[PDB]
Design a protein around this nucleic acid. Structure first.
Length: 70
DNA sequence: AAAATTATGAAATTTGCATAAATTC
DNA sequence: GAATTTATGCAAATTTCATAATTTT
């Protein structure tokens, strides 16, 4: 049931942290447009669902992601 | 109304289906 | 050589760039 709702959850987190789509989605290497289409109910591919899941529950940290970008 | 943010059409890239090739047993 | 595993051409679905529309300040 959850994969269809996860993007909306993701949006609520981001909103609550007062982050742009660019800021939030790019930690995962996901573009702003793509973030926009997910937040409005485009099919969330399973790997992105997994990442959002682990992120939202606090198991993957912003710092871990920032380390991996660089 | 300018700046910043989000949404969208369409080109290009990526994925997964069919199945061909290869490998294992 | 059959079963199983892996690779590959290509259709289709997905991503992103370019930018339009919207929202914020």
């Amino acid at each position: 049931t959850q994969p269809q709702n996860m993007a909306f959850r993701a949006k609520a987190t981001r909103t609550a942290r007062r982050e742009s789509q660019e800021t939030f989605w790019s930690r995962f290497g996901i573009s702003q447009s793509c973030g926009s289409r997910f937040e409005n109910g485009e099919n969330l591919p399973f790997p992105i669902y997994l990442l959002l899941h682990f992120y939202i529950e606090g198991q993957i940290t912003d710092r871990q992601l920032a380390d991996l970008r660089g």
